[PDB]
Nucleic acid binder design. Structure first.
Ligand code: MG
Ligand code: MG
Ligand code: ZN
Lengths: 94, 40, 83, 105, 16, 222, 263, 1114
DNA sequence: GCATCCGTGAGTAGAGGAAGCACAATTTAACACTTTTGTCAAG
DNA sequence: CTTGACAAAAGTGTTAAATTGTGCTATACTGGGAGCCGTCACGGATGC
């Protein structure tokens, strides 16, 4: 099973809300090129390539691990979508 | 499927229909068996 | 009143699902004469139109969830409440 | 822009049916047996349902997007995308009325 | 004659 | 006349039209009974209707008569030779001006289209339309490579000067969709015909140089 | 009215009905213009009504209209929109999809509950756009077109393509399906494992839910594309997450014949 | 390998020719060798004598004789050139002008009749085909009980199919006996009056029963003239047609008295005569002679109905499923019926031809147009349901396909309509139709197989043989009887003990009318010939059949057909005795005609010098491709100078070893679980099988392409292909076709063809590209033939046909066609399907090295590992006995023949196992080796399990285990023994036609449909996977909305969506949001074509345009 | 309360699939013939 | 950049010629040819 899947299910009132949060965080990570992550350098997911260990390109794993960390806030009617995107662009250029 | 309170937004009608209809092939046919369920 | 599954399904309010189940001609003629309007409440109608079904991750209860990290959230709140 | 929320079905009046159509089909001819091109006023007429290929009239005088939304005077075929051939309907003017079998049988 | 058969109906009509 | 493309009632109505024509043209002075003169017109109307309405792809009357004569000759040769004749025999029997090539072309013309809803096999879940690909709309790969070519060509034209790029994109029809001419492009910039031919050639040479130094554009040529 | 590769013409049955209707309408117009008697006009109007009925719904009233030279009734609009082979049940409620494969299944005892054995060639064909992008990223190919031409011919495929493919599928999952899909666990998400061969390896514990043994069964493979699709497959549809039966609540992935015997 | 035989039943007759049902029927139909004056009136001759003479009423066309010429081309030429192997048919006709009285005679070509090969198949358009026999209700008179009313019976008169209406006679509650014809009811009194029946006559004949006759004595019509009665009946049947006596009498005569339209077949006439106890003059219900109608069958059938209703002892109802009431139409009868309908069409063509055009100068050649007959024959042989593509994976496949019986087809039942009644095994199938053999699924009970000893008689009824028993001693007089005749005797069983020829047992198990009984030797009248007559040829190849459940013997017999020929195929160790006969009667091998000496032996030919002096050369079929792609070749089995007797084998056929059927291999099988690789029917095999080329087969694939004339120009098959490097053209010869012997992989070019590009201006970007590179666009484009994905091999043959070539008939517009044959040698791999004769099937899931397989104490590893958990649920215990006997024969080096239901029993197998142990353990003692420690541990554990007798020496305990078929088996990985003794033996296992190489398929993007724009289907079309309704239901249940939306729009028919998704994926971005499907747009447009205004609205009921403004009139 | 009409009946695969002739009217291919475009050369 | 030429591709009539559309044929002829039962069985709604 996915690591910490029980904790992920226990953090939300509906499993589909968990899926929505994971997918949205994955797309946020993909759009900004993984520069908006809340993961420390020792916590970034890695993959074993013939050359060596490199950052995992799968954003869903990154989103799940970040949600496991607990530094993400999710909910409904937090911030306006346009303002959220504009601020995320400003802090994290892409 | 999870032994916990159902999450809001689940398509319980489709699950109900599938659960009822899956063991239909195991019901006897030879007012008894699958015809009984069909008339009910 | 009590009716079977077939009669109860054919007498639904949405003409798309009823037409896609059985008696397409009868359902369509009764809907066209009555000018019936389908509100797209169930799943078959959304499947036919290729829309997002109102179940699972497509339900209004969870579909509008927003995720945001600490730093950007603090930026959005501080740069606005400062006024 | 706006999202589809409802689907309505209703009867179509003769006026509405004529409003849908881009032209009346007057001949049963489909295509020419030798040139394999659609026949005028037929079931596959370009002057009614649109051009066969994008931005090109029947007479081959306009062949680029510059003259978009135009109708060639020589052939009458509108210069637009050929995909409109999937979306443009025609109509047949009956000499006498004919009942719809759905509302009879 | 036969309502559902057009040929028989036409023949009956022309036989009058 | 049944079994030749038209239903019985259609033949009857066409014969009725012929009968109306016969009544219009009949003369009773000659003392011939009506049926003798009306039969000609009825048969004429029925035959013309068959020649005009028995095929999805309409064929002219003279060509229909040619096809019918060819079929009759082929049948006679088949029943006389005790085998299916080749095109040479049929052409020889038809007469002067007929060779094997003309017979083959006539046979190819006389081919009726096949219905898209003809089932194949006992199972009633397969049709011809299920095996005919659509080759009009571009495939996703074709659209993707067209977009890639457009992007790479736009990035290649940036190295050109501001006017040379405009001259090339006008002469090649990258702006208005249609190619212009040196005189027409010259009117836009006020330049004479000859000068544009030289600046365009110079820009083309510069693009060739850049392509030779990068080779980022040779793959899209297939 | 399309022309097949061989040069022959193929057309639908609606054209014949339209031609019949148009011919009868024009002939009625001509007869009216000629002042024809009442019997002829009545017959022509009756034929016009019958042609309209055949076009709208063929076979509902009277003998079905058939193409001359055959006894197969022509396909009308009602036949198009109705039945098991109609528009709804064949093209709207169900469709054929891209990025889909199918192959014979064999048992993999070494796999984990969330893993499956996917043949290398099936993975190459299913993940082709991602593989081309990865090949472009590395030095394998200069651009996407060159990579696709390279993958066109089997003998032109080098050995780094397989390493790129292994890199591409990292984390992603695929949906395995066995027909008939009696219940919802007839489709399950598994993490692919590239294997040598041409048969799919299936975990023993998911056989009862799939109702799949190994005397010749086949299964279909589907590849979800976006982040929502991957998230749903990994969180909701994963095999290791659906352990209890939705119908009764009892375990459905549980020890089976050989495991029970050995214990 | 000496062959030991088991059994005690002495069979008195051999099996009949297994293909005689196909051969003799067609010989009777054609009668191509009988002299014209001695031909009997059946088949084609019957058709001519029935349709002719054609009379204009004064032109008469009369038929004298017909003949069949030599076929234009041989079978091989027809196969190569896609022709039909047929013979010319001419007819001799004479035209008589009755006015003048002059006869002109000439011979007219009536067409080509397809010919049947010596094996019993046809070559239609170059493809092998088989005409399947059809079982249906025999015509005649039947008397069934009315279900609505107890005590009421109804009479049915049934003619040949499409040869007259069914006639119903029913005693109405009012008492009047009503007659139903063509869905119309009327009083039978009227028709009886039409046929010259008074009142006193009916009272004199039908008045000895009771009140029933009173209901059929209406005097309001008795006095009325038969003329007026006939006109009244004519008006009643078809109403509206103006009453005329001529039309009325013509209609009645055509309905019940015209031999050309009503035909009570010979079987029907015989059944009616034997039931009603009458003698029919003809084969019609009534006879129209002397201007009056005369009754033939209505009076006797009404008498029988009345007496049945009365309840006299001699009358009983008819069972319509009784096999004496069901008959078989073979290829001959179906072909004759189609020939007759074509001849009737020709006769009507002649009739409306001789009524116009130079009446005086008419010759038979001008009047006869033979096209309708040829057309009907071609439709029957090409697009009939019973004319099926020949199944020739192996000779047994074709043999079964020829010996199959189908209740479907024209004039038969329906796959969906029939159920629970026609699909059952009736008691009369014993010895006539095989019960176990049938296709499981929607066709169960509808398609069956003819029994081994059964044969169809002239009338179409299946007969079975029985030995005559007189006075309690069984004689050698064999009588072939039908079910109706069989029901009159007490028939004993073939397993009854005999002391010579006298029945020794005091109690004999017999059958009376299908009911088992115990009788005395003096009550026995007939005896079964053998236990094989109850089962078909396919089922008779299963040893130890009595130990297998029927549901699994069905699977085994069905799968015997699907086995592919192997290059090292060997006959089974345990046989039943039919292998040699199956090979002999399939005509796949080559046998000597008479005694002689072999003069020349070669891989392509065998030349034999016979005693009479003639030298006969037999060519050998080498590497021929069957319909299923398998390789069918013959290997010589003689040497130069060898003396051969009559019937001796000269060359083996496909799937045969020295004349015995060889569908698989004999492998060393251990029955035990193995690390879960045996889980759920999976099979584990050793790598040693691949090392010595076991289960290796040769398959040949055909690729075809044609060059065509187009409007823009002719397609050229050339080696000069634009924009291709030299590597792609390396294997193409100067003609553009791949050279023979070249190894081809997917994507390689087989033949190079260029097609003229359609005139179309290019995009501006392409023009800029060509301007930059200075390359002028060509006029031809690559349209060559390449190897499809997952295919390839070695090019073995190329066939090139051109327009001017003799014999070939290319369709117009095609100049030439090129065919390429690619052969590949397939080895056993993971995913391939193996099976055995006892219904045990599974796919190979693992291939282990030789050092990992369990091995015997002497070091011999096993070849296959089978899971024991598949036996208890399936109850197929025959494989266990086969394994025991195979082990016994493996250590004794002999093969066995155990006939089904009379063969080897456990005591004999245990004696053989004792000898096998004495030769298996005595060698170890002779070599100076005692008892293994591991064996001692296994013996201790087995004695704890009660498998051996405590206190015995280790050798005796090992012998006991061996007598149980179990041996001490070691583990190849650890070296330690398996904790319990394992069942090891030798089993015959077949490799089936279902291979994973031909079933794997994947697709990213490809062709799309025309109207719906959805992906096509099928691996050949490179199509996608059908995501039906239940898959959508599963995704909805999971709550995966986005995955479902993707599969509905992005991956199926969202043109913009799919293009954008592909571009985004190849550009490294995420796929965009999907849009409206094109299928919904098609639905909306088709609903608008029905004058229905379908409109899509928004939140505020305002119209929303989903067509992007492309359908709005400005 | 009996006749009568009408709609429904599992999935995924595969592989095998019989008129002629005359004369006027409307395209169409060949032929010149004149601008209308690329080139070329210099200044 | 601007002039003045020149050869070739393209647009413009003109016409004999294939190609297509239309009309007429006068002994007398006057209401069709298929097609026919393992009819599929069971509900359901409607009309008498
Ligand atoms: Mg299975
Ligand atoms: Mg089957
Ligand atoms: Zn135009």
């Amino acid at each position: 099973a996915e690591p910490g899947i029980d904790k992920l299910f226990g953090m939300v009132d509906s499993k589909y809300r968990l899926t929505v949060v994971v997918a949205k965080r994955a797309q946020q990570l993909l759009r900004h090129g993984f520069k908006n992550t809340v993961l420390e350098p020792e916590e970034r997911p890695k993959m074993q390539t013939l050359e060596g260990l490199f950052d995992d390109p799968n954003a869903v794993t990154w989103a799940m691990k970040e949600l496991l960390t607990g530094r993400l806030v999710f909910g409904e009617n937090l911030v306006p979508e346009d303002r959220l995107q504009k601020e995320m662009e400003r802090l994290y250029p892409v | 499927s999870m032994a916990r309170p159902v999450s809001i937004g689940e398509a319980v009608g489709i699950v109900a229909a599938q659960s009822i209809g899956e063991p239909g092939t195991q019901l006897t046919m030879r007012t008894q068996g699958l015809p009984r369920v069909i008339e009910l | 009143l009590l009716m079977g599954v077939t009669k109860s399904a054919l007498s639904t309010k949405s003409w798309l699902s009823a037409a896609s189940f059985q008696n397409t001609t009868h359902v369509l003629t009764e809907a066209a004469i009555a000018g019936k309007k389908d509100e797209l409440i169930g799943l078959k109608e959304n499947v036919i139109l290729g829309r997002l079904i109102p179940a699972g991750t497509g339900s209004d209860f969870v579909r509008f969830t927003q995720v945001v990290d600490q730093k950007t959230l603090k930026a959005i709140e501080e740069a606005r409440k400062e006024a | 822009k706006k999202e589809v929320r409802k689907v309505r079905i209703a009867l179509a009046s003769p006026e509405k049916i004529r409003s849908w159509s881009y032209g009346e089909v007057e001949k049963p001819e489909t295509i020419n047996y030798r040139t394999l091109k659609p026949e005028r006023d037929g079931l596959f007429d370009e002057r009614i349902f649109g051009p066969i290929k994008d931005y090109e009239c029947a007479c081959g005088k306009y062949k680029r997007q510059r003259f978009e939304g135009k109708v060639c005077e020589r052939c009458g075929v509108e210069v637009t995308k050929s995909i409109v051939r999937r979306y443009r309907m025609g109509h047949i003017e009956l000499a006498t009325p004919a009942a719809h079998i759905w509302f009879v049988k | 004659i036969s309502t559902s058969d057009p040929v028989r109906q036409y023949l009956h009509e022309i036989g009058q | 006349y049944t079994g030749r493309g038209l239903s019985f009632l259609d033949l009857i109505q066409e014969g009725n039209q012929g009968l109306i024509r016969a009544v219009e043209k009949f003369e009773y002075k000659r003392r011939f009974k009506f049926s003798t003169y009306a039969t000609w017109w009825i048969r004429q109307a029925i035959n013309r209707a068959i020649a005009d309405q028995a095929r999805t792809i309409r064929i002219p009357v003279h060509m229909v008569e040619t096809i019918n004569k060819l079929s009759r000759t082929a049948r006679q040769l088949q029943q006389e030779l005790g085998r299916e004749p080749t095109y040479e025999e049929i052409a020889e029997a038809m007469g002067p001006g007929w060779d094997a090539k003309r017979v083959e072309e006539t046979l190819k013309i006389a081919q009726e289209p096949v219905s898209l809803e003809t089932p194949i096999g006992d199972e009633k879940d397969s049709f011809y339309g299920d095996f005919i690909p659509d080759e009009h709309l571009p495939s996703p790969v074709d659209a993707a490579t067209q977009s890639l070519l457009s992007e790479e060509l736009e990035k290649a034209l940036s190295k050109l000067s501001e006017r040379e790029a405009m001259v090339l994109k006008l002469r090649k029809g990258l702006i208005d969709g249609r190619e212009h001419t040196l005189e027409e492009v010259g009117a836009f910039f006020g330049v004479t015909r000859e000068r544009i031919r030289q600046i365009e050639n110079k820009a083309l040479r510069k693009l060739k140089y850049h392509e030779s130094r990068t080779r980022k554009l040779r793959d899209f040529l297939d | 009215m399309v022309q097949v590769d061989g040069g022959r013409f193929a057309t639908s049955d609606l054209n014949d009905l339209y031609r019949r209707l148009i011919n009868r309408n024009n002939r009625l117009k001509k007869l009216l213009a000629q002042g024809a008697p009442e019997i002829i006009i009545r017959n022509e109007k009756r034929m016009l009504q019958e042609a309209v009925d055949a076009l709208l719904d063929n076979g509902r009233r009277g003998a079905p209209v058939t193409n001359p030279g055959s006894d197969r009734p022509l396909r009308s609009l009602t036949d198009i929109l109705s039945g098991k082979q109609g528009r709804f049940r064949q093209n709207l409620l169900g469709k054929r999809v891209d990025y889909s494969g199918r192959s014979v299944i064999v048992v993999g005892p070494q796999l984990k509950l969330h893993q499956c054995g996917l043949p290398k060639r099936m993975a190459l064909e299913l993940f082709k756009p991602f593989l081309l992008k990865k090949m472009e990223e590395k030095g394998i190919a200069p651009n996407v077109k060159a990579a696709r031409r390279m993958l066109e011919r089997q003998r032109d495929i080098k050995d780094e393509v397989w390493d790129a493919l292994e890199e591409v599928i990292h984390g992603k999952v695929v949906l395995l399906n066995r027909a008939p899909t009696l219940h919802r666990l007839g489709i399950q998400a598994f993490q692919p494992v590239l294997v040598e061969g041409q048969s799919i390896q299936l975990h023993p514990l998911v056989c009862e839910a799939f109702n799949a043994d190994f005397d010749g069964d086949q299964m279909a493979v589907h590849v979800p594309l976006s982040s929502f699709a991957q998230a749903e497959a990994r969180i909701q549809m994963l095999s290791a997450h659906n352990l209890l039966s939705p119908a009764s609540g009892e375990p459905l992935a549980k020890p089976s014949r050989d495991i029970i015997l050995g214990l | 390998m000496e062959i030991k035989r088991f059994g005690r039943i002495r069979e008195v007759i051999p099996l009949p020719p297994l293909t005689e049902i196909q051969v003799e029927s067609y010989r009777r139909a054609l009668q191509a060798d009988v002299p014209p004056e001695k031909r009997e009136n059946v088949g084609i001759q019957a058709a001519f004598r029935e349709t002719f003479p054609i009379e204009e009423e004064g032109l008469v066309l009369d038929f004298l004789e017909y003949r069949l010429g030599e076929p234009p081309f041989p079978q091989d030429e027809c196969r190569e050139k896609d022709l039909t192997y047929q013979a010319p048919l001419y007819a001799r006709l004479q035209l008589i002008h009755k006015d003048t009285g002059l006869i002109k005679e000439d011979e007219v070509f009536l067409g080509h009749i397809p010919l049947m090969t010596e094996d019993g198949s046809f070559i239609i358009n170059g493809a092998d085909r088989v005409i399947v026999s059809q079982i249906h209700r025999s015509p005649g008179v039947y008397f069934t009980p009315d279900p609505a009313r107890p005590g009421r019976y109804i009479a049915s008169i049934i003619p040949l199919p499409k040869r007259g209406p069914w006639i119903d006679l029913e005693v109405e509650p009012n008492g009047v006996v009503s007659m139903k014809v063509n869905k119309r009811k009327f009083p039978l009194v009227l028709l009886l009056r039409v046929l010259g029946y008074d009142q006193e006559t009916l009272a004199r004949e039908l008045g000895a029963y009771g009140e029933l006759v009173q209901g059929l004595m209406d005097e309001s019509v008795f006095a009325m003239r038969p003329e007026e009665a006939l006109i009244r009946l004519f008006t009643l049947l078809r109403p509206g047609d103006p009453p005329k006596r001529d039309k009325a009498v013509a209609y009645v005569y055509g309905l019940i008295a015209d031999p050309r339209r009503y035909d009570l077949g010979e079987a029907g006439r015989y059944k009616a005569e034997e039931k009603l106890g009458i003698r029919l003059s003809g084969r019609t219900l009534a006879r129209f002679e002397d201007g009056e109608f005369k009754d033939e069958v209505f009076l006797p059938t009404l008498r029988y109905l009345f007496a049945l209703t009365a309840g006299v002892p001699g009358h009983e109802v008819d069972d319509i499923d009784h096999l004496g009431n069901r008959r078989i139409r073979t290829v001959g009868e179906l072909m004759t019926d189609q020939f007759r309908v074509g001849l009737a069409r020709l006769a009507r063509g002649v009739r409306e031809r001789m009524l116009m055009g130079s009446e005086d100068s008419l010759t038979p050649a001008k009047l006869v147009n033979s096209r309708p007959l040829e057309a009907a024959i071609r439709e029957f042989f090409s697009r009939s349901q019973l004319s099926q593509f020949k199944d020739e994976t192996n000779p047994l496949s074709s043999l079964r396909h020829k010996r199959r019986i189908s209740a479907l087809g024209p004039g038969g039942l329906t796959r969906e309509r029939a159920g629970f009644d026609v699909r059952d095994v009736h008691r009369t199938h014993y010895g006539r139709i095989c019960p176990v053999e049938t296709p499981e699924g929607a066709n169960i009970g509808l398609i069956t197989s003819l029994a081994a000893y059964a044969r169809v008689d002239e009338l179409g009824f299946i007969r079975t043989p029985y030995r005559r028993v007189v006075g309690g001693v069984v004689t050698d007089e064999v009588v072939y009887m039908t079910a109706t005749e069989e029901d009159r005797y007490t028939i004993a069983q073939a397993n009854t003990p005999l002391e010579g020829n006298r029945i020794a047992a005091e109690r004999v198990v017999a059958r009376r009318k299908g009911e088992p009984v115990i009788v005395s030797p003096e009550e026995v009248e007939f005896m079964d010939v053998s236990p094989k007559q109850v089962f078909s040829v396919n089922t008779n190849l299963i040893p130890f059949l009595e130990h297998d459940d029927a549901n699994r013997a069905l699977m085994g017999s069905n799968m015997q057909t699907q086995a592919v020929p192997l290059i090292r195929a060997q006959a089974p160790v345990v046989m039943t005795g039919l292998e040699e006969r199956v090979v002999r009667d399939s005509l796949a091998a080559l046998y000597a005609e008479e005694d002689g000496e072999v003069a020349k032996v070669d891989g392509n030919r065998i030349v034999v010098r016979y005693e009479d002096g003639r030298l006969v050369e037999y060519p050998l079929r080498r590497f021929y491709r069957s319909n299923q792609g398998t390789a069918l070749d013959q290997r010589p089995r003689v040497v130069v100078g060898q003396r051969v007797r009559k019937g001796d084998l000269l060359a083996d056929g496909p799937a045969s070893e020295n004349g015995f059927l060889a569908l698989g291999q004999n492998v060393l099988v251990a029955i035990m679980p193995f690390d879960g690789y045996n889980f759920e029917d999976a099979i584990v095999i050793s790598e040693e099988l691949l090392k010595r080329d076991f289960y290796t087969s040769i398959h040949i694939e055909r690729y075809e392409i044609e060059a065509r004339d187009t409007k823009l120009g002719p397609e050229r098959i050339t080696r000069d292909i634009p924009h291709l490097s030299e590597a792609a053209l390396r294997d193409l010869d100067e003609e553009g076709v791949v050279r023979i012997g070249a190894e081809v992989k997917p994507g390689d070019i087989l033949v190079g063809r260029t097609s003229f590009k359609g005139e179309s201006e290019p995009t501006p970007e392409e023009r800029l590209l060509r301007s930059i590179f200075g390359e002028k666009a060509r006029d031809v484009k690559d349209t060559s033939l390449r190897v499809p994905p997952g295919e390839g091999g070695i090019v073995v043959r190329t066939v090139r046909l051109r327009r001017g070539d003799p014999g070939v008939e290319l369709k117009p517009g095609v100049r030439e066609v090129v065919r390429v044959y690619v052969a590949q040698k397939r080895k056993l791999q993971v995913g391939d399907k193996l099976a055995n004769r006892h219904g045990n099937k599974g796919v190979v899931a693992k291939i282990l090295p030789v050092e990992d397989m369990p091995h015997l104490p002497d070091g011999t590893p096993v070849d296959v590992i089978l899971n024991p958990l598949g036996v208890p649920s399936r109850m197929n215990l025959g494989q266990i006995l086969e394994t025991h006997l195979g082990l016994a024969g493996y250590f004794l080096g002999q093969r066995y023949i155990s006939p089904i239901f009379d063969g080897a029993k456990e005591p004999e197998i245990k004696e053989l196992l004792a000898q096998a142990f004495e030769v298996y353990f005595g060698k170890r003692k002779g070599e100076g080796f005692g008892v293994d420690k591991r064996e001692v541990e296994v013996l201790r554990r087995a004695e704890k399990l009660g498998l051996v007798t405590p206190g015995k020496t280790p050798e005796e305990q090992l012998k006991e285990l061996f007598l149980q078929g179990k041996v001490v088996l070691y583990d190849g990985r650890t070296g330690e023994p398996i904790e319990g003794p394992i069942v090891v033996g030798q089993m015959f296992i077949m490799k089936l036609y279902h291979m994973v190489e031909d079933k794997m398929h994947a697709r990213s993007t490809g062709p799309y449909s025309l109207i719906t724009q959805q992906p096509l289907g099928g691996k050949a079309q490179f199509g996608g996977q059908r995501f039906g309704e239940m898959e959508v239901w599963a995704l909805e249940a999971y709550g995966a909305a986005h995955t479902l939306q993707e599969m509905l729009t992005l991956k199926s028919d969202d043109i913009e969506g799919r293009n954008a998704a592909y571009e985004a994926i190849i550009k490294g971005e995420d796929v965009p949001e999907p849009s409206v499907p094109e299928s919904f747009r098609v639905l909306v447009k088709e609903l608008q074509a029905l004058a229905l205004d379908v409109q899509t609205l928004d939140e505020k009921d305002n119209p929303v345009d989903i067509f992007e403004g492309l359908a709005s009139k400005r």
